Amino acid sequence: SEFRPGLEGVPATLSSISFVDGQRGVLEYRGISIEQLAQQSSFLETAYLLIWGHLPTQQELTEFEHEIRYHRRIKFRIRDMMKCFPDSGHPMDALQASAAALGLFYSRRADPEYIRAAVVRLLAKIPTMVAAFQLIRKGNDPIQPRDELDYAANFLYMLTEREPDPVAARIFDICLTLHAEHTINASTFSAMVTASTLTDPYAVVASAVGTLAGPLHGGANEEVLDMLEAIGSVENVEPYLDHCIATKTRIMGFGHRVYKVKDPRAVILQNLAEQLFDIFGHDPYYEIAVAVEKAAAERLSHKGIYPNVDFYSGLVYRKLGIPSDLFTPVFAIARVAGWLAHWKEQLNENRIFRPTQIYTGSRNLDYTPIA
Amino acid sequence: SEFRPGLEGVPATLSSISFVDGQRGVLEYRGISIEQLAQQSSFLETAYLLIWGHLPTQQELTEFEHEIRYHRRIKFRIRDMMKCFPDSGHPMDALQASAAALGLFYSRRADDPEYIRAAVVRLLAKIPTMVAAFQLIRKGNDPIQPRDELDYAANFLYMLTEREPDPVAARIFDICLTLHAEHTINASTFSAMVTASTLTDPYAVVASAVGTLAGPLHANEEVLDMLEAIGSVENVEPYLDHCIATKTRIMGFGHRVYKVKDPRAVILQNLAEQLFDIFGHDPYYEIAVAVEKAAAERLSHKGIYPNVDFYSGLVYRKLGIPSDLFTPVFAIARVAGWLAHWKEQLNENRIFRPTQIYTGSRNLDYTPIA
Amino acid sequence: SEFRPGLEGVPATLSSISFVDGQRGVLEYRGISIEQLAQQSSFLETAYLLIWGHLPTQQELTEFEHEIRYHRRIKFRIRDMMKCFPDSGHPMDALQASAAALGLFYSRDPEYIRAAVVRLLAKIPTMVAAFQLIRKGNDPIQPRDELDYAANFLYMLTEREPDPVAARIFDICLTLHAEHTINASTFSAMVTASTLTDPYAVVASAVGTLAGPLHGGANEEVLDMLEAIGSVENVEPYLDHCIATKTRIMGFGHRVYKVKDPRAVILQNLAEQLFDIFGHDPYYEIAVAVEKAAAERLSHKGIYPNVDFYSGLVYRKLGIPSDLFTPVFAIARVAGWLAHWKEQLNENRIFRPTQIYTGSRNLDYTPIADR
Amino acid sequence: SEFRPGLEGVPATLSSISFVDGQRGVLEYRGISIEQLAQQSSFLETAYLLIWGHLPTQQELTEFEHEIRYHRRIKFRIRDMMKCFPDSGHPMDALQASAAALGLFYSRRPEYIRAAVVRLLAKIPTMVAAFQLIRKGNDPIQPRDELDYAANFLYMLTEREPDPVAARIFDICLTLHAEHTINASTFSAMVTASTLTDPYAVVASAVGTLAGPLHGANEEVLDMLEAIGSVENVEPYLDHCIATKTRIMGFGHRVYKVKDPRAVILQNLAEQLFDIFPYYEIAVAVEKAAAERLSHKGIYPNVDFYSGLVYRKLGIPSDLFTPVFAIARVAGWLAHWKEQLNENRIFRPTQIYTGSRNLDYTPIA
């Protein structure tokens, strides 16, 4: 019981956030059925139960809304510092540096407000540090938003400048709830690795944004939408499907290592995407994707995989009018709230972690300069 | 069924780059005896042994030294953006928020020999530049353009002080930094290995490394502060009584395993004695010496020796070092392990993704507003 | 995996003797509500429904009345041993060590299914007043089998003939003391009940564990605080000091009840009736003043004055010793434990569980010369 | 899971006292290889590591010896109190109720964790000895002042001093019965250990649960050994009991299944001891006959078989097994209690209600 090349699987501490059973396919968010919660709720009480531990009171919700509105403003000297940056480089590194922005912003108060205030502060702040950076990289100056819109509507208007209907708003809200949280991600793993050191929240969040990026950041669902665009026509996809079968690679958007029985996220995504394509019309790329999906369903019948939620998700992102390469910022936005709840929990534990390792080094040498 | 505390003693890897004894007071840096290396070896030779694997030859080392001097400039757009930098934050937090985008000078994401030594030399150079900058910047001083003529120790001393110092003190400081070029693999190194496998970019790596270098709310500084608060040898018995009440190891005394007068502290004490012989003994030096004699009159039999924190604070005071960045000075010394780790971290590539003890309730419902 | 730490909420068995519901303050003993069951009944019928489970007849009532009255004899060797007992101890430990050796009298099943029953039923108040007067050092006051159970207890323990109303109130209180939540008494009772050794050691361990938390009890500190009231006019200062102390209000607060468990309501009604009939004295006036002062603003918590506060007042009206309230409640507690043991005879099931081996491994023993 | 009548076998606490491995058959008392520890150890430092937790020094040993000697006497008033007991009950229950009263001696209610600890450690032996003497009726006397602990126990129980070889054997035997996994003893103890009050009611409830139904395995082992009798009837009675279809006595442990090398040490020590010291031949014949008779169950001569043998080699009282059983179990119970006291949690599990509802008072019952 002392062999772990790679140090994988050893459970660490007491889970306190979400109940999920991959074999059973049960999504009980803190014991609450994820589908049932998403059936009749909004992200407000969701995050309330996530970090605050319960859905708050009505007056509490109204006060939280008014306060988030109050702190929804923007900074000017920041824009001056922001004006001192380019508009072409690696957006992941750009946003990572943009994390340090809040560093000196309120660095002095290292309490109740230190708990209550800074949370909603980071909530109303991070979306600016992301979207304004995107606008600047696009060469577009910021605009002071109107306060008569939802936070999601606020971000949508900031990135789009249009007045939409709220059906797509509720759809995008459920979507944010979809990629919102899960069990311990490797990002969440390193977060817990740093969630105890009792230094500050800002530097932890910054290092989380940094290490959260995988190899070259990016990801798969972006490549999924890219391959959907590259699909074009699906008439020859059958020869392409056969060539890919001869290529020995995983079926795109199929067979999650944990989700293997078509976790309700994927099925709900497919159903809602069908409803949207019925309401607003189906795209020719959407038709090509549907044809490719039918061909795949008739192709293998042996992988046990299902069309992942990414099938609906890349399509919804493209149809909503979203830049292709911005997915990683959305992933960080989702992970921020989970990291917040995790750090709120971690505040209790005065664990003071420290590891130790094994040595396979040499010994008893004799040095020689100019070797 | 056991969940050991902090996974203390887990086989995360099989480290072969170094070793430590902890019983005979032997620390094997690339398997090298402390005194034998410390006799007459430049820090660059040990760095070449650690990073290049072997003590490099004359030609390649000279080429590296020339290229280092060939790349010791200060960016202009840096000072331009720096005009928007604040002037209140912690100096270590300052160094972090400063390095927050130091990598943006190159985003190649690749060549192989180049991004095995080029960004390496960039890191080896740019640190003291931004360090002395923030040092003068906090003072609101006009920035001074850099020059690679004086030795890195002497160059940094002149940059921070506008004064050419005696190089003997520079060599002593280099030796102390070698004694401080790292510690045992730290929680910094721990989180580094928690990120070192992906080999994405050394920039954010050393960034999060410096971020973790800050402890709980971010040794030598507090000990020196306590010594200054005490002052002379008149408060000896009251301080002893207060410490006995406090029931804690004497400030500047007590080690986890180095209960054998860890050789780093002994070497620091010998060097401090030589320096006080050369530089003279100050009233603070005499008072602290009397206090140390009084403490040794009580804690000799406990196997506990004065910690290197006091000697480091005394050296900084004699060097006239600002208090706010002695931790940044250590980071300048200590973060040198990042390069050797990355060189070792590049050897393998493994992904760790463990589970958690599910101490959360299993079944509940969805309450609408209740 | 998962482990709710150490016997917290896991349901044990589908027992059906009683039932407690906190939604509306429902106590269903054999499915019978307490409030209606207390109208015009005797504790004997309640004990029948509890242990025997069947409503008994008046013929058996007279028979058992004759039998138990014949079971009032005091053991002489018990008195001789008491002559060797100490003289400065704890009454609870006294009762424990006293009953600790009942096996000396009855020693070494189908017929012994009612013998020890009536035996222990009679044994309690006698030995109680015995140890009490034993502390006093006076000669014993032999009881009489012509007085009612409450009347006989009052006489023997007090050498005075009482009036009926206080005895009826005491019986009602014993009924209030009858049933509670799942008690560590009942827990350890069912625990030792798997051993199937003897009801004697069962009641023994029940007394042993039933001791107050660290030999300190809620009712003891409640009477202590009632004495600590002292003056009455300064209630506002002490109230503010305790508000600063932020403790569960002295004489207010349970662990699971916040909907006014009707036990306290009936206690308030009985206390009002008694203080109306009986002399109030300064105690009742100061208590009424302090109670009104406390109830002035504590309504923000949805609780009332605690039962133990009224228990102290009841003991004062009885002039009871401090430690007396412990066995006073223990009477009805062990009475319920009797029905618990009766139900415990149902099935044979003995646990032998495991735990989490939180330790190191592969150690070594070094020589003392080496050490 | 929890919906299992009885609710047994689930992990409960991250204990740091005992570690066992049945499949490996390795025993490590907080990391102590059983036989390897038994090679060159003494029970004193053993209990020191068990409860105190660390190996002590020699000066501590001398101080402990002097203190134990200082606190080794008994009370005459206690002896008089002992005379008041009746004489028709279980001697084990007798010893239990006897210890159940010691509170009138060192009650009180840092240093108030150690002195009464060693006092209760030295206490129960002479108490149970006088209890046995009273059950008989014969008058006992105070022990000597130069004997070893085992030597004192012998010069009390048999009122005579034997050699030290059997003393070391009994030292191993106590270590042989030193501890085990979480017993029902430990479960009930934790059930009663809630408020972390004191050893007084602790060892009390410990005994009060320690007894079993119907008033012992080693007792039943000796009964069957007497039933073994001569050589020729082993096969006939063995086949008759095979037709009876009963669990293989002297064998077949539900939990232990690797035939713990402690049992091997027991067999070897029995062989080494019987050589210096009859009916052992008849017992060995019965054992070999049963072994050749079963050959399929993997059921080997259990501990109690050799335990009764060692007791006969000492010549212990018939029901005296419960006494040694407590002498082993109670110390570990006390260590577990002292540990669990540090928790400060107060368990309070809630059961399942499957009762009736809506019942009203019958005017005629």
Tab-separated table of C-alpha atoms in Angstrom, chain B residues 77-264:
chain	number	residue	atom	x	y	z
B	77	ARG	CA	6.962	50.375	-22.075
B	78	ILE	CA	7.506	48.743	-18.677
B	79	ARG	CA	8.076	52.119	-17.020
B	80	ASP	CA	5.202	53.439	-19.132
B	81	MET	CA	2.795	50.893	-17.650
B	82	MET	CA	4.575	51.287	-14.306
B	83	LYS	CA	3.344	54.891	-14.249
B	84	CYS	CA	-0.066	53.392	-13.440
B	85	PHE	CA	1.315	51.064	-10.754
B	86	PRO	CA	0.218	51.821	-7.172
B	87	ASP	CA	2.425	52.764	-4.234
B	88	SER	CA	0.904	51.025	-1.181
B	89	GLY	CA	1.009	47.221	-1.561
B	90	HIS	CA	3.286	44.721	0.153
B	91	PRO	CA	6.779	44.563	-1.394
B	92	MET	CA	6.455	40.814	-1.926
B	93	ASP	CA	2.943	41.391	-3.266
B	94	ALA	CA	4.534	44.146	-5.338
B	95	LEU	CA	7.026	41.686	-6.836
B	96	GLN	CA	4.190	39.268	-7.579
B	97	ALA	CA	1.904	41.818	-9.250
B	98	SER	CA	4.959	43.038	-11.165
B	99	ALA	CA	5.915	39.614	-12.510
B	100	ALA	CA	2.191	39.174	-13.229
B	101	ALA	CA	2.954	39.742	-16.916
B	102	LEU	CA	6.757	39.512	-17.199
B	103	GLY	CA	6.350	36.604	-19.623
B	104	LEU	CA	4.385	38.701	-22.125
B	105	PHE	CA	7.755	39.683	-23.620
B	106	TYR	CA	7.669	36.330	-25.484
B	107	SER	CA	4.730	34.016	-26.286
B	108	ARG	CA	6.391	31.594	-28.696
B	109	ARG	CA	4.919	28.503	-26.978
B	110	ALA	CA	7.870	26.436	-28.252
B	111	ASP	CA	12.144	26.727	-30.271
B	112	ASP	CA	13.361	23.719	-28.296
B	113	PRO	CA	16.983	24.751	-27.552
B	114	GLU	CA	15.895	28.394	-27.387
B	115	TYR	CA	13.044	27.877	-24.920
B	116	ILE	CA	15.323	25.667	-22.863
B	117	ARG	CA	17.852	28.442	-22.263
B	118	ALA	CA	16.521	31.720	-23.673
B	119	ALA	CA	13.558	32.332	-21.374
B	120	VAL	CA	15.814	30.757	-18.753
B	121	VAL	CA	18.376	33.548	-19.133
B	122	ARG	CA	15.539	36.075	-19.288
B	123	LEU	CA	14.333	34.871	-15.891
B	124	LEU	CA	17.894	34.749	-14.527
B	125	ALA	CA	18.346	38.406	-15.481
B	126	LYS	CA	15.083	40.365	-15.267
B	127	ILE	CA	14.357	39.678	-11.579
B	128	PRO	CA	16.812	42.047	-9.806
B	129	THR	CA	15.946	44.709	-12.377
B	130	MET	CA	12.251	44.880	-11.475
B	131	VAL	CA	13.184	44.314	-7.832
B	132	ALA	CA	15.442	47.364	-7.541
B	133	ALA	CA	12.913	49.241	-9.674
B	134	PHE	CA	10.044	48.662	-7.248
B	135	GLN	CA	12.515	49.498	-4.480
B	136	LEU	CA	13.157	52.920	-6.006
B	137	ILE	CA	9.619	53.157	-7.403
B	138	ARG	CA	8.046	52.928	-3.945
B	139	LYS	CA	10.439	55.718	-2.944
B	140	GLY	CA	9.183	57.658	-5.962
B	141	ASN	CA	12.687	57.929	-7.423
B	142	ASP	CA	13.478	58.550	-11.069
B	143	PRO	CA	14.257	55.204	-12.743
B	144	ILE	CA	17.910	54.470	-13.480
B	145	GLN	CA	18.802	52.680	-16.699
B	146	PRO	CA	20.719	49.422	-16.165
B	147	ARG	CA	24.371	48.612	-16.781
B	148	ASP	CA	25.886	45.119	-16.958
B	149	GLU	CA	29.479	46.185	-16.225
B	150	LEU	CA	29.654	45.601	-12.480
B	151	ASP	CA	29.128	42.066	-11.217
B	152	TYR	CA	25.524	41.052	-10.566
B	153	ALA	CA	26.058	41.502	-6.830
B	154	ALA	CA	27.935	44.771	-7.355
B	155	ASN	CA	25.561	45.802	-10.147
B	156	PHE	CA	22.527	45.257	-7.914
B	157	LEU	CA	24.227	47.067	-5.029
B	158	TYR	CA	24.961	50.083	-7.233
B	159	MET	CA	21.475	50.029	-8.763
B	160	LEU	CA	19.760	49.962	-5.368
B	161	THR	CA	22.290	52.284	-3.715
B	162	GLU	CA	24.029	54.371	-6.427
B	163	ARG	CA	27.218	53.311	-4.625
B	164	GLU	CA	30.012	50.960	-5.651
B	165	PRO	CA	30.541	48.546	-2.728
B	166	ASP	CA	33.502	46.503	-1.572
B	167	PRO	CA	33.314	43.165	-3.416
B	168	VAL	CA	34.282	41.163	-0.312
B	169	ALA	CA	30.840	41.875	1.134
B	170	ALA	CA	29.390	40.961	-2.265
B	171	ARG	CA	31.122	37.571	-2.131
B	172	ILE	CA	29.927	37.030	1.442
B	173	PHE	CA	26.379	37.897	0.360
B	174	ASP	CA	26.677	35.487	-2.569
B	175	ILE	CA	27.808	32.734	-0.196
B	176	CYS	CA	24.887	33.450	2.144
B	177	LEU	CA	22.477	33.409	-0.805
B	178	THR	CA	23.955	30.040	-1.745
B	179	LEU	CA	23.137	28.950	1.804
B	180	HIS	CA	19.686	30.449	1.093
B	181	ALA	CA	19.316	29.580	-2.612
B	182	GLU	CA	16.475	27.305	-1.485
B	183	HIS	CA	15.112	25.340	1.447
B	184	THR	CA	13.784	21.812	1.645
B	185	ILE	CA	11.222	21.335	-1.113
B	186	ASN	CA	8.700	23.894	0.054
B	187	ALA	CA	4.936	24.173	-0.148
B	188	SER	CA	5.979	26.477	-2.962
B	189	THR	CA	7.746	23.505	-4.551
B	190	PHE	CA	4.742	21.380	-3.580
B	191	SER	CA	2.224	23.485	-5.504
B	192	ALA	CA	4.845	23.795	-8.240
B	193	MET	CA	4.891	20.029	-8.705
B	194	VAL	CA	1.110	20.347	-8.473
B	195	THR	CA	1.517	22.429	-11.636
B	196	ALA	CA	4.977	21.462	-12.958
B	197	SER	CA	3.803	18.376	-14.873
B	198	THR	CA	1.860	20.119	-17.656
B	199	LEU	CA	4.957	22.112	-18.737
B	200	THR	CA	2.694	24.845	-20.111
B	201	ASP	CA	4.816	27.933	-19.428
B	202	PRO	CA	7.574	28.617	-16.875
B	203	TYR	CA	6.350	32.208	-16.480
B	204	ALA	CA	3.070	31.525	-14.668
B	205	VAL	CA	4.887	28.664	-12.938
B	206	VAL	CA	7.431	30.915	-11.229
B	207	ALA	CA	4.579	33.394	-10.755
B	208	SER	CA	2.436	31.038	-8.680
B	209	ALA	CA	5.679	29.920	-7.027
B	210	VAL	CA	6.356	33.438	-5.775
B	211	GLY	CA	2.685	33.707	-4.833
B	212	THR	CA	2.978	30.630	-2.623
B	213	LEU	CA	6.309	31.908	-1.274
B	214	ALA	CA	4.230	34.176	0.951
B	215	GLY	CA	3.189	32.279	4.065
B	216	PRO	CA	0.083	32.558	6.233
B	217	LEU	CA	-0.751	36.201	5.566
B	218	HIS	CA	2.698	36.330	3.925
B	219	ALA	CA	11.812	34.484	10.110
B	220	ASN	CA	14.619	37.042	10.070
B	221	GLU	CA	12.325	40.082	10.033
B	222	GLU	CA	10.193	39.276	13.084
B	223	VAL	CA	13.211	38.025	15.046
B	224	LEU	CA	15.125	41.226	14.305
B	225	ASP	CA	12.047	43.251	15.257
B	226	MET	CA	11.853	41.468	18.612
B	227	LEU	CA	15.585	41.961	19.186
B	228	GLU	CA	15.266	45.678	18.420
B	229	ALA	CA	12.271	45.935	20.754
B	230	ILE	CA	14.281	44.319	23.555
B	231	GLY	CA	17.411	46.390	22.996
B	232	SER	CA	20.108	46.061	25.636
B	233	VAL	CA	20.973	43.428	28.252
B	234	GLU	CA	18.861	44.971	31.031
B	235	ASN	CA	15.585	43.198	30.112
B	236	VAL	CA	17.166	39.735	30.297
B	237	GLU	CA	15.367	38.225	33.294
B	238	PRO	CA	11.983	39.837	32.459
B	239	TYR	CA	12.230	38.535	28.890
B	240	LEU	CA	13.125	35.071	30.183
B	241	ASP	CA	10.117	35.135	32.515
B	242	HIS	CA	7.834	36.342	29.715
B	243	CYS	CA	9.101	33.553	27.452
B	244	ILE	CA	8.578	30.957	30.190
B	245	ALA	CA	5.012	32.237	30.480
B	246	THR	CA	4.617	32.126	26.687
B	247	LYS	CA	5.626	28.428	26.678
B	248	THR	CA	7.218	28.729	23.228
B	249	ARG	CA	10.664	28.038	21.819
B	250	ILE	CA	12.895	31.101	22.112
B	251	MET	CA	12.477	33.451	19.165
B	252	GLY	CA	15.348	32.513	16.903
B	253	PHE	CA	15.599	29.039	18.474
B	254	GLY	CA	13.890	25.776	17.575
B	255	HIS	CA	14.047	23.545	14.509
B	256	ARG	CA	11.825	20.776	13.173
B	257	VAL	CA	14.673	18.279	12.695
B	258	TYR	CA	17.855	20.409	12.746
B	259	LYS	CA	18.306	19.920	16.497
B	260	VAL	CA	22.053	19.551	15.919
B	261	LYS	CA	22.951	23.208	15.259
B	262	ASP	CA	22.229	23.145	11.500
B	263	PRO	CA	25.432	23.942	9.582
B	264	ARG	CA	23.878	26.876	7.719
